[PDB]
């Protein structure tokens, strides 16, 4: 810090969020840095009375933490490199705009719609790196569409994982795992090709420490966080959590009502010839040991009939704790994991 009015990253991000992230005033140049801050946000293991819980740890040494209760009251704490512990309660209607701007799932009588601030796929991947940080509406359970009901639940995890890793956006404890690094991880699990499953060593003891370390070395984050990661991977449950995350059938409750518009979109697109979907995943282990997976699949979608010719992104969230003591084993994962499913639609302004 070199100036009294110089804010930590944590503080900068928080002010922007409550003021409104879509507030028109922004300088575009501000909009760019604002997104670059918003992506440090990570959903983590919530507690008894929390809708969801967000955590951001910046490079400057600041930390933003935010809890949203079931009744929707927000508590944010900001820490800084100089040990200030700023705290703020939003219990009136002050959290009004803030709720739209977080990795949380809300009870909502219709599907949440957002706006950006989309030709090629570099574009498509960034749009989801944005919406994976916005809010989603919860999809109520139905037996006909829960991937975890029916015949062969979790049958594709290893295949889905094998082909997912190298192509995903992926965070472990807020440390980004780049494509090269994911590939090492895939190997480290024993996933050579489309039809292999994981070596029983990994299933019983997580990744080896030797691999766990190189993988971190090759990723992007703080030394403290890389160390958090290495410990995470040397755990059986990291296996469960990583593989479960890639389970494509998580998209089914979301696709049930949207699949027709998703088609119109590949069609509307096909007259221009291309991929449709991408992945963005955050996994976190709380300091108390708890594993949480938030899994995102971004997908191109046509808007409803009222706005023809507009294409946006359906963003599907799948969220769950992976309870200590659950190895990566279908019949096991099936009775232990309890995914919760939410979506959002984002469209471009103009």
């Amino acid at each position: 810090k070199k100036s009294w009015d110089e804010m930590s990253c944590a503080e900068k991000l928080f002010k922007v969020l409550s003021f409104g992230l879509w507030n028109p005033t922004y300088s575009r140049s501000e909009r760019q840095s604002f997104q670059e801050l918003l992506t440090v946000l990570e959903p983590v293991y919530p507690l008894p009375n929390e809708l969801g819980r967000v955590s951001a740890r910046f490079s400057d040494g600041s930390s933003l933490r935010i809890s949203v209760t079931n009744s929707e009251l927000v508590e944010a704490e900001i820490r800084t490199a100089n040990n200030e512990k700023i705290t703020v309660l939003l219990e009136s209607n002050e959290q009004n705009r803030l709720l739209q701007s977080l990795p949380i799932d809300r009870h909502m009588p219709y599907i949440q719609v957002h706006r950006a601030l989309l030709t090629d796929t570099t574009s498509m991947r960034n749009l989801l790196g944005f919406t994976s940080k916005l809010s989603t509406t919860l999809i109520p359970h139905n037996a006909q569409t829960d991937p975890l009901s029916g015949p062969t639940p979790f049958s594709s995890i290893f295949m889905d994982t094998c082909r997912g890793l190298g192509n995903a956006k992926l965070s472990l404890n807020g440390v980004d795992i780049p494509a090269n690094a994911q590939k090492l991880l895939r190997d480290a699990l024993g996933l050579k090709d489309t039809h292999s499953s994981p070596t029983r060593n990994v299933i019983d003891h997580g990744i080896s420490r030797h691999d766990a370390e190189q993988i971190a070395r090759e990723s992007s984050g703080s030394d403290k966080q890389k160390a958090e990661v290495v410990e995470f991977l040397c755990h059986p449950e990291a296996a469960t959590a990583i593989c479960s995350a890639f389970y494509q059938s998580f998209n089914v409750p979301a696709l049930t009502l949207t699949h027709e518009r998703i088609s119109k979109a590949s069609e509307y697109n096909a007259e221009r010839s291309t991929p449709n979907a991408c992945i963005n995943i955050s996994i976190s282990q709380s300091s108390d040991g708890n594993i949480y997976v938030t899994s995102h699949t971004g997908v191109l979608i046509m808007a409803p009939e009222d706005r023809p010719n507009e294409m946006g992104m359906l963003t599907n969230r799948t969220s769950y704790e992976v309870p200590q003591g659950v190895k990566c084993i279908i019949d096991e994962m099936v009775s232990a994991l309890q995914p919760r499913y939410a979506a959002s639609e984002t469209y471009l302004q103009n």
């Binding site: 192509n167 696709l255 590949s266 979907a277």
Partner: peptide, 14 residues
């Protein structure tokens, strides 16, 4: 059936 509408991005494309 419904997953058939998804076409996942792949690094290996120019």
């Amino acid at each position: 059936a419904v997953l058939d509408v998804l076409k996942f991005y792949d690094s290996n494309t120019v």
